Structure formats: structure tokens, C-alpha cells
Design a protein around this motif. Structure first.
Motif, short mmCIF file in Angstrom:
data_model
loop_
_atom_site.label_atom_id
_atom_site.label_comp_id
_atom_site.label_asym_id
_atom_site.label_seq_id
_atom_site.Cartn_x
_atom_site.Cartn_y
_atom_site.Cartn_z
N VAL A 44 0.83 -1.20 0.00
CA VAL A 44 0.00 0.00 0.00
C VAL A 44 0.88 1.27 0.00
CG1 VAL A 44 -1.74 1.28 1.30
CG2 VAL A 44 -1.95 -1.18 0.94
N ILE A 45 1.97 1.25 0.76
CA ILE A 45 2.89 2.38 0.82
C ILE A 45 3.47 2.70 -0.56
CG2 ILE A 45 5.25 2.96 1.55
CD1 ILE A 45 3.09 3.84 3.40
N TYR A 46 3.88 1.65 -1.28
CA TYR A 46 4.43 1.82 -2.62
C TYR A 46 3.35 2.23 -3.63
CZ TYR A 46 8.81 -0.10 -0.78
OH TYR A 46 9.98 -0.32 -0.06
N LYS A 47 2.13 1.73 -3.47
CA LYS A 47 1.04 2.22 -4.31
C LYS A 47 1.05 3.75 -4.26
CE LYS A 47 -3.09 -0.71 -4.51
NZ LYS A 47 -4.22 -1.32 -3.73
N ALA A 48 1.12 4.32 -3.06
CA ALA A 48 1.11 5.77 -2.90
C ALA A 48 2.38 6.41 -3.48
CB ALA A 48 0.93 6.18 -1.42
N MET A 49 3.55 5.89 -3.12
CA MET A 49 4.81 6.46 -3.59
C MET A 49 5.00 6.35 -5.08
SD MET A 49 5.84 8.05 -1.04
CE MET A 49 6.90 8.17 0.53
N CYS A 50 4.49 5.27 -5.67
CA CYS A 50 4.55 5.06 -7.10
C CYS A 50 3.81 6.16 -7.84
CB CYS A 50 3.93 3.71 -7.43
SG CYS A 50 4.15 3.20 -9.12
N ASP A 51 2.58 6.42 -7.42
CA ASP A 51 1.82 7.53 -7.99
C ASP A 51 2.54 8.86 -7.81
OD1 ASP A 51 -0.49 6.64 -9.32
OD2 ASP A 51 -1.66 6.53 -7.49
N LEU A 52 3.11 9.08 -6.63
CA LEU A 52 3.78 10.35 -6.35
C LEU A 52 4.98 10.56 -7.27
CD1 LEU A 52 3.98 12.85 -4.57
CD2 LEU A 52 5.46 11.57 -3.07
N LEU A 53 5.79 9.51 -7.43
CA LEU A 53 6.98 9.56 -8.29
C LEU A 53 6.62 10.05 -9.68
CD1 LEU A 53 9.96 8.93 -8.68
CD2 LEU A 53 9.31 6.64 -9.51
N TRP A 54 5.69 9.34 -10.30
CA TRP A 54 5.23 9.67 -11.64
C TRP A 54 4.49 11.01 -11.68
CZ3 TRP A 54 7.60 7.65 -15.42
CH2 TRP A 54 8.13 6.35 -15.32
N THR A 55 3.70 11.31 -10.66
CA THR A 55 3.04 12.62 -10.62
C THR A 55 4.06 13.74 -10.82
OG1 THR A 55 1.16 12.00 -9.26
CG2 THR A 55 1.88 14.30 -9.16
N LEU A 56 5.12 13.72 -10.01
CA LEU A 56 6.18 14.73 -10.08
C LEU A 56 6.89 14.74 -11.43
CD1 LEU A 56 7.83 14.30 -6.56
CD2 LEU A 56 6.28 16.10 -7.29
N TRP A 57 7.15 13.56 -11.97
CA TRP A 57 7.72 13.42 -13.32
C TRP A 57 6.85 14.08 -14.39
CZ3 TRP A 57 5.64 11.00 -17.66
CH2 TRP A 57 6.52 10.78 -18.73
N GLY A 58 5.54 13.84 -14.29
CA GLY A 58 4.54 14.40 -15.21
C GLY A 58 4.46 15.92 -15.15
N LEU A 59 4.65 16.48 -13.96
CA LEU A 59 4.71 17.94 -13.81
C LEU A 59 5.96 18.49 -14.51
CD1 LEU A 59 2.43 17.28 -11.94
CD2 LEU A 59 3.31 18.85 -10.24
N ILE A 60 7.07 17.74 -14.45
CA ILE A 60 8.31 18.12 -15.13
C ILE A 60 8.11 18.14 -16.67
CG2 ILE A 60 10.76 17.39 -15.57
CD1 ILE A 60 10.23 18.78 -12.80
N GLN A 61 7.35 17.17 -17.18
CA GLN A 61 7.00 17.14 -18.61
C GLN A 61 6.08 18.28 -18.99
OE1 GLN A 61 8.96 15.22 -20.09
NE2 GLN A 61 9.49 14.74 -17.95
#
Length: 294
Positions: A237-254
């Protein structure tokens, strides 16, 4: 044009040279992948790291998880693998549709993590996160951006509270990366591979497949060889959250770099809102507390 570009590359590869039959494009934006006869030709898309992928895929192949790697081009990165006949490329929908598919995903991970595969690089979840955060400094960001980042500190801390196991992990197990025969899953696209907490893979697949509670149980049970435990479940469950966060931040960079590969202002908002939703459930603090307690 896309197909002609591909049939150009054939010249190079002796084992595909002079193949005059049909070339089928199989799913994938960042990798152009064409089926030629019974072999698959993979072309790299114009920031990723091909030296890693080559070593990773060969090891994954040795572990019986990835299809055989028959050729690599040290000039172009182009890769020839064997095509798996009667195999279905997966997706969220097919993971609900094909009974036992989550379990088969868990069995594939189990084989992978339990293998002798050795990946050269270490997966650095929070290094990457901090990196993207700095870079920010700035676009318009979602509501509660700073809370989710602050709260992630607590998550990081919970993960650091105890030694975690380290396994050869795929690290970006998108549904599309799974090829399902009836009875077993193979996995492809090893460009993000690295040593990692094995449960990152489980968490990532779950979030990418929009897995419901039931699918998660089926996945973990098949993976662990028994019902998951509160600390284990908590890590997923922790990684479910962190996984989304990682990509969220990446997507803002794009979105700030105007990469026109898709609607980043959307992609980012989606994955964040889901993440924020998960972190706000009272269940999440219990899962966190279970990871901290070990």
C-alpha cells in the motif's frame, strides 16, 4: 513511414535480414516494437538507459521471466527477442477479465525475485523524488502538493525504520509489459530494472492495473505462497502511494518542459489525486503504522 523506418533496421540484423513478410507493431510509445516472423524487433524512442536494459533483460531471460534476448545492437540499442505465440498483452481490463491473471503476475514476480538475476543499479525511490522536487523551483501544482510531500517524509521514515529485503526488480511493471499465455506471464521492458524492495513491483502493478482489494489478495497470495501479513500488505500500500507520487512529479516536469507526448496537466492530476486519496484513508495510517512496527 513508421514501418519503413523499422524495415530499414532489418538490414543490420543478420537473423532478420531479407524478411519480406508482414511487420506488426505491438503496443508501446517509448519503444517501437514490431513482430517479424517469430522474432520481435524493438527500436528505442527518441533520458532512458540502454546499457542497463541489455544486462537486465539478459538476466531476466536467464531467470525464465523474460523472453530470450537473441540480439543487441551496440550502435543503436535495437534488440531482437523471441516472439511468444498465443500470448496476450495485458491491461487493467484484462486483469479483471482473465481469471487468475493477478496470481500469474505474482508467480512471475516470485520467480524473478527468487532468481539469481543480478541487476547492476540500485533503485533510488527517494533520491529521484527529492531530485524532481528541487527541479520544481515553478509551474502551477495540485491542491495539497506540499502535504503529500510532507506526509511522504513519514512514509520514507517508516520504510527506513527496518531493514528491507533487496531483490532484482522490474520497477516499472505496467500492464502492457506482461504477456499472458493461459498459464504463465512473461515480462518485457527492463529499462528501469534495478535492485529494490521486491514489494515495490507488487505495489506498482497494483496501481497501474487499477487492482481492487480482491486482486491484491490474489497477487500477494500467489507471490508469497500464503496470505500476506500486515507489514507486507502495508509496504505494498505504501508503494502504491509512492509510485503515484513519483510519476506525478515526473509528469509535472514534462508539463513544464512542454513534452507534447500527451496531456501532462491531466496525467499528473490523475495520479496525484488517486495518491492523495489513498494517503487520506484511515486505512493508510494503519498500513503505515504496521510497516513502522515491523
Amino acid at each position: 513511414m513508421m514501418t519503413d523506418e523499422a524495415r530499414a533496421k532489418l538490414a543490420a540484423i543478420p537473423m532478420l535480414a531479407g524478411y519480406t513478410g508482414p511487420l506488426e507493431r505491438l503496443g508501446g510509445l517509448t519503444n517501437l516494437v514490431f513482430r517479424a516472423g517469430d522474432l520481435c524487433l524493438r527500436i528505442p524512442g527518441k533520458y532512458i538507459n540502454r546499457a542497463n536494459e541489455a544486462v537486465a533483460a539478459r538476466e531476466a531471460a536467464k531467470a525464465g521471466v523474460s523472453p530470450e534476448v537473441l540480439h543487441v545492437d551496440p550502435a543503436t540499442g535495437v534488440m531482437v527477442t523471441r516472439y511468444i505465440a498465443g500470448a496476450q498483452t495485458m491491461s487493467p481490463e484484462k486483469f479483471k477479465t482473465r481469471p487468475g491473471s493477478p496470481a500469474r503476475a505474482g508467480e512471475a514476480f516470485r520467480k524473478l525475485h527468487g532468481s539469481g538475476a543480478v541487476f547492476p543499479f540500485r533503485f533510488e525511490l527517494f533520491a529521484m523524488i527529492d531530485d524532481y522536487l528541487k527541479v520544481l523551483s515553478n509551474v502551477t501544482l495540485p491542491a495539497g502538493y506540499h502535504d503529500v510531500v510532507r506526509e511522504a517524509g513519514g512514509v520514507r521514515s517508516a520504510l527506513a525504520a527496518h531493514p528491507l529485503p533487496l531483490a532484482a526488480c522490474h520497477c516499472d511493471p505496467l500492464c502492457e509489459n506482461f504477456l499472458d499465455t493461459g498459464e504463465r506471464m512473461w515480462i518485457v521492458d527492463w529499462e528501469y530494472s534495478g535492485m529494490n524492495d521486491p514489494l515495490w513491483d507488487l505495489g506498482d502493478l497494483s496501481v497501474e492495473g487499477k487492482f481492487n482489494a480482491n486482486q491484491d489478495e490474489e497477487l500477494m497470495r500467489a507471490y508469497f505462497g500464503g496470505e500476506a501479513r500486515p507489514a507486507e500488505r502495508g509496504r505494498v500500500v505504501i508503494y502504491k502511494a509512492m509510485c503515484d507520487l513519483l510519476w506525478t512529479l515526473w509528469g509535472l516536469i514534462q508539463l513544464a518542459n512542454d513534452n507534447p507526448v500527451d496531456d501532462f496537466r491531466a496525467y499528473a492530476d490523475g495520479r496525484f489525486a488517486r495518491c492523495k486519496a489513498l494517503m487520506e484513508t484511515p486505512e493508510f495510517s494503519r498500513h503505515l503504522a504496521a510497516v513502522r512496527m515491523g
